[PDB]
Homo-oligomer: A and B are copies of this chain.
Amino acid sequence: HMDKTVNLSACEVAVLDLYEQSNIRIPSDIIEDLVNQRLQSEQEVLNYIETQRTYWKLENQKKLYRGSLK
């Protein structure tokens, strides 16, 4: 969706590739975060991203009780 590919550090950009080439689409939202956190290494970004991508699984999973039901 014309994603916010802003200021990818050499590690970030490298591991971002491994994701999309792995067929793991990244939410631009966590790119927005990651770029702000600004880590050093490929290992650090792949650690951080996988944990934050597991936060995402939870926030993609958790209960909304509908509310405005029809």
Please determine whether B28 and A62 come into contact, CB atoms closer than 8 angstroms.
Answer: no
Give A14-46 as 1s and 0s: 1 = Cβ < 8 Å from B's Cβ atoms: 110011011111111110110000000111001
User: Across the interface, which residues of B come within 8 angstroms of A42, CB to CB?
Assistant: 67-68, 70
Bound-state Cα–Cα, A19 to B32, Å: 21
Binding site for B on A (CB under 8 A): 1, 3, 14-15, 18-19, 21-30, 32-33, 41-43, 46, 50, 53-54, 56-57, 59-70
Q: A18-B64, A27-B27 are in contact. List 9 more A-B contacts (CB 8 A).
A: A3-B29, A15-B68, A21-B67, A22-B63, A24-B60, A28-B28, A28-B32, A53-B60, A57-B61
